[PDB]
Design a protein around this ligand. Structure first.
Ligand code: PBM
Ligand code: PBM
Lengths: 104, 57, 104, 57
């Protein structure tokens, strides 16, 4: 089974992936780590073809908001120890672009 | 020019088309990249498939 | 052609990769690009089994030194445009740790 | 026992073992982990190899 063709992350792709993982009951609460996340990104990359360079969050401290509008996971402190926290409002409020309009 | 699925594919996104090995497709768009827009001959369902998972019939 | 088994990075493996990639000349002077590098790292991950989280460089501006001791490449200017420059003495001097112990 | 290569390999060091598809091997150790130490019957050289690239002869 070949590595799927590479493609850009999208708003719609980020919304489906978030709901899918939420269904899977994984990231919720899970303590964040570059390794765990790289593992995630690589899985999504292998499986769906979304190049592993989209899951960037905003600079801390506090909650880190996803730059990818449509990705419904934010990082909530619980270096701060962060936990992946689903928030469907991120599919409706591009917080990161307001806090840091420069990235866009 | 029909195509046949060489492997199984399970979409997670909504615009992707899940399919099983052996399923046959008719490509609607293939110039927009390596993820083609295919129509299932079996179900009439349209969506994007990993072009590298299908081969001509 | 399966993705090779995972295997930890080690001074020796970083030193070996440096000379390996030097043999298959191509990085020299090549203009750096996170994408170009992400591609490189994924190739080594599938090919040789080193989880893509080793080739991290120090902050800018100026020369960006490799954080993994053994990796004999640094990013050299000409924001700032960078290139991959093989610097053999990086295997004998952990510059990155000297100048940026915060990452250690 | 003897094992054979399903695909090629290209080592980044002399401590590992490069090879081609079909090369036979004598596994000198496989209790270290997933990268086995073996001897190429087709060259008479020892080095580590990705266990998943070789299958039993
Ligand atoms: C685990 Pb990566 C190729 C930013
Ligand atoms: C290449 Pb020196 C100054 C241990």
């Amino acid at each position: 089974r070949p590595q799927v063709p590479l493609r850009p992350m999208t708003y719609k792709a980020a919304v489906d992936l978030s709901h899918f993982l939420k269904e899977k009951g994984g990231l919720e609460g899970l303590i964040h780590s570059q390794r765990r996340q790289d593992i995630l990104d690589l899985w999504i990359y292998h499986t769906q073809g979304y190049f592993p360079d989209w899951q960037n969050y905003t600079p801390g401290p506090g909650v880190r908001y996803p730059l990818t509008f449509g990705w419904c996971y934010k990082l909530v402190p619980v270096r701060e120890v962060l936990e992946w926290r689903f928030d469907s409002r991120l599919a409706f409020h591009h917080v990161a672009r307001e806090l840091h309009p420069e990235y866009f | 020019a029909l195509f046949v699925a060489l492997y199984d594919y399970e979409a997670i996104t909504e615009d992707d088309l899940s399919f099983h090995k052996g399923e046959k497709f008719q490509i609607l768009n293939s110039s927009e990249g390596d993820w083609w827009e295919a129509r299932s001959l079996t179900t009439g369902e349209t969506g994007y498939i990993p072009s590298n998972y299908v081969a001509p019939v």
